[PDB]
């Protein structure tokens, strides 16, 4: 039906794309590696996605230089916890800022 | 490893606060805590039971990693 | 998911290491008798468990020189509490403290 | 299990007593008859019980010296609502306060 | 039975009286037209029913003189939302205020 937008959730950012295929998380995650930030990762149960702090899996990756580990390390995550959020987020240590900060798979 | 040093001279009404001892542990700052929670608690259950813990330090701490793995790697790191 | 520590509860004390054996009762009450103190069972229901003041049962073991009668007794609250907490508490008459203060049954 | 007291719950009054007796409410009527009170019946839903106002059923019974009635309405309220507390209540006119407040019907 | 009013839930307006028949919907549209008010539709669940404003469908209607379109778009609101209230407004330009309130379907 034409016209009634219906409200619906959305977590920060990207929601209203669909979903991130592989090709594109690998140039998210080579541009996030280029800018020089520290790749992180979180997940919590949908219910709790308003708190303040998720949980870490498992600590920031300081400086990796190989973006083949964390699409290999998001996917451990996301097994071990197949009913939560699974973020990404990237970690200035200059600024003390996130330059990046999406959720990459949606909960089962 | 100080644990029982700390508690069979510093009894049961002190604070214990680290500086780099929870933090310091490779499974997190997470894991760090779960390290000397379980280890305090030991040498407690120990003084109860009328063990020496100060003597006995590394028979009462090395039995508590078995059921904590945490514990199990914190004895190796700061060794010994 | 080594190493991957979640949040994990415990009531007080003791409740990081595995559950207390019927010896380890034994050497706790005594040890707890030597020091003077008189032991008291307290229980609730888990919901409850973050409550103030628990439930007695049924009063404190005043002027009690013996532990071969106190393991006696932390049975029958059990049994007749077979869902509720079971607390095994110390009381200081001169300093208005506790000496000791760790759950013995876990609540079925 | 003796000595152990366990927590109930009672209404006001008369809840530590086992179920009144219909002679006893002949009884009770011709008191608040006799001391000139305005009998009233109420009635609320149970989980409700800690409002202060309950409902009236229907109105108060002004100037009423014949106790004939009260029982059979006070019985008709309870097939009305049979899953409702059932009050007695008598009203001072010359104070504006109760003088006997007590539950019949413990609530089906 | 005679006489003790029960409590019922009532939206605002003309809820008190049966639900009204397609020609008196029928005078309430053209009663709104003729007084040169805007008509315009709105639905809620019956849960957020106290909600302060509610959500439209699908735009207000400026100054329309053709009350045939209203009595369609309404049946469609119903259709795509069975389970939700179905209001009917009139919207003042002049007084910045609200001609007429009145909840037209209920919600199976």
Redesign the interface.
């Given at each position: 039906?034409?016209?009634?937008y219906q409200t619906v959730a959305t977590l920060e950012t990207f929601g209203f794309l669909p979903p991130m295929t592989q090709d594109e998380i690998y140039d998210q995650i080579a541009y996030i590696i280029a800018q020089g930030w520290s790749p992180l990762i979180e997940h919590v149960h949908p219910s709790r996605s308003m708190a303040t702090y998720w949980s870490?899996?498992?600590?920031p990756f300081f400086g990796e230089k190989d973006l083949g580990v964390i699409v290999s390390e998001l996917e451990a995550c996301h097994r071990?916890y197949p009913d939560h959020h699974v973020r990404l987020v990237g970690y200035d240590a200059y600024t003390q800022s996130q330059g990046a900060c999406f959720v990459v798979f949606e909960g089962r | 490893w100080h644990m029982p040093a700390l508690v069979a001279i510093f009894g049961d009404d002190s604070v214990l606060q680290f500086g780099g001892g929870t933090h310091g542990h490779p499974?997190?700052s997470?894991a760090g805590a779960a390290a000397n929670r379980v280890a305090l608690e030991a040498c407690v259950k120990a003084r109860n039971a009328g063990r020496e813990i100060e003597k006995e330090s590394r028979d009462i701490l090395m039995e508590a990693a078995k059921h904590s793995p945490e514990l199990a790697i914190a004895l190796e790191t700061w060794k010994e």
């Open positions: 039906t034409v016209g009634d870490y899996w498992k600590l071990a | 499974w997190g997470a």
